Write a structure and sequence with these properties.
Chain lengths: ~350, ~350
């Protein structure tokens, strides 16, 4: 039905309010669906952006589960699935979208939530829901490059794209060249591997792999895929095999592992990305930075380097021992078949 | 006369005693010319080596100044012109050879001294005397590679040359290949410049340049060659220009200067040379070695790093000021003409 195609419009222009009209359509949102900022002038808006629209999508006003947790993350904040706290927020939102029985209520829940929660988070939570509901199958999700170009492109282009789009009429617009080999000069031998590290393609593959094989949510909510452990081993293992190949093609040696976490990290990296959602840039790492104990009260991270070292020491022990121990105290054997997994 | 050609025989086999016979000749040395080790069995020797020679060169017994200072340096010790003490020893010996009126007494002094003083030192002292004594002009001094191959060749070959020369008859002897690119592997990017750093040619040029333009000997005219200061600047300046060129041809950046002496030296170098005169090998320098205050009582070196730093600070000051100050206290101006010199 249409509903499937109407959800895809949510991916359009993530930071433009949902009432501004996406593609050749526009949403006819209730006033209790308007944000607190814009609700007090709702009448002036629905009318103002009604123009230029072929279709008008109605949206029924429903109950809507509590969106406190989803909304806890700031709108101008970054979103990562590695941070403990974000995991709990996303997994909760995924749970809401996943828990809407009908494809019509999913559209209603989405339309409301969209302008209240972090765009990056919304995109993830929706992507995961759509991909793993039964009614929304075979649905072609727009490339995350197209919805979030800031994670894939030198920040320099953005003010050129703004200039070009404002000054020059459509049809006469020149294609914007995206800078390559732009993060470091030839003094850094690492700069040679730009075509791999910074390639759009491989970064998309990595992002998507983690979409379809998450490590947290609910085992029935898509965590427990056959041999996902072995997959995690192999896929990442092939990344380095391919990387090491490309290294040899640029007169470099094989990548040296992170022997130990106390010694400095020789290779710094300034990525040159600017998050338009956070309105800030990603920080760089300097040469010879040292790993430091984390105390990020907000993010819910209280971890010492020694904690990491302790985990490693134990994992090594298990691997040599040949077995692990479950919470219960029983032993599980790292056999030829399932060991790696 | 013959005398000129007879001195060249001293350069032959530097560590073989002078009574063993050089080329197609042999020396008829007095018994008071024999060393303390060999004098007590002089009769057995002069006879044992005398034959199979077309010539026997007589040598008249002369007075001979005290050779204490020349003999102060051990026979199995290394010799460098940079070490303060060696400078005083060599300059004194040079003075003796230089001070022998006749080309016959030079031959007599030499023949005596040769087996009592350090071979490396002898070679230098003689080389300098011949080139600047007035009788021995326009001469052909043998290449120092041929007399001291240990300073120009991987030590590995020496036991092959000994094997080949003992086992195989003359005429059937295979040429010994000299290893190239042998001091470091491809993990060290510096190894690429072997063909320049370790080339026989350029090392000979450097050695010889310092022969004809010494910086301190005795008698100022020998040091005082036209614009030798500017020469010292330019010649060495061209070495680095050429080096920096060769760097660019091996995918390397321009050579980084020694900014400051307290910071570690990143690039180590093990030269793989074995001094047959010292019977030891040259020490290597490890990666990230640090310069340290010297206290070499024997060599007469008592220098702190800060001394070096102080000299540099003062030289910079003079250069910026635009003038220097002589011992007397007067000022000399670094003009366009003689400034560099
Ligand atoms: Cu020099």
């Amino acid at each position: 039905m249409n509903y499937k195609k109407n959800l895809l419009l949510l991916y359009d222009r993530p930071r433009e309010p949902i009432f501004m009209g996406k593609g050749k359509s526009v949403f006819d949102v209730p006033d209790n669906y308007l944000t607190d900022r814009y609700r007090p002038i709702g009448p002036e808006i629905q009318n103002r952006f009604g123009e230029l629209a072929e279709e008008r999508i109605p949206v029924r006003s429903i109950a809507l589960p509590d969106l406190r947790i989803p909304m806890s993350l700031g709108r101008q904040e970054q979103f990562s699935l590695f941070i403990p706290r974000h995991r709990k927020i996303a997994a909760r939102l995924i749970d809401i979208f996943m828990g809407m029985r009908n494809i019509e209520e999913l559209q209603s829940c989405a339309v409301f939530a969209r302008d209240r929660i972090n765009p990056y988070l919304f995109n993830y939570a929706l992507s995961v829901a759509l991909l793993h509901r039964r009614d929304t199958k075979n649905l072609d999700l727009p490339s995350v490059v197209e919805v979030f170009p800031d994670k894939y492109v030198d920040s320099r282009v953005f003010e050129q794209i703004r200039e070009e789009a404002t000054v020059v009429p459509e049809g006469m617009r020149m294609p914007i060249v995206i800078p390559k080999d732009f993060t470091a000069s030839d003094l850094d031998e690492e700069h040679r591997l730009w075509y791999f590290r910074e390639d759009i393609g491989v970064n998309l593959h990595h992002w998507h792999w983690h979409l379809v094989y998450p490590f947290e949510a609910s085992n029935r909510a898509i965590v427990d895929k056959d041999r996902r452990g072995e997959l995690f081993y192999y896929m990442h293992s092939q990344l380095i095999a391919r990387y090491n190949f490309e290294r040899f093609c640029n007169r470099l040696q094989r990548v040296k592992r992170l022997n130990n976490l106390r010694e400095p990290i020789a290779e710094g990296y300034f990525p040159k990305l600017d998050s338009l959602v956070a309105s800030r840039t990603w920080p760089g790492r300097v040469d010879n930075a040292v790993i430091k104990d984390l105390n990020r009260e907000l993010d819910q991270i209280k971890q010492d380097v020694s904690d990491l070292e302790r985990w490693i020491d134990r994992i090594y022990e298990a691997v040599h021992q040949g077995y692990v121990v479950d919470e219960s105290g029983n032993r599980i054997f790292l056999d030829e078949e399932k060991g790696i997994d």
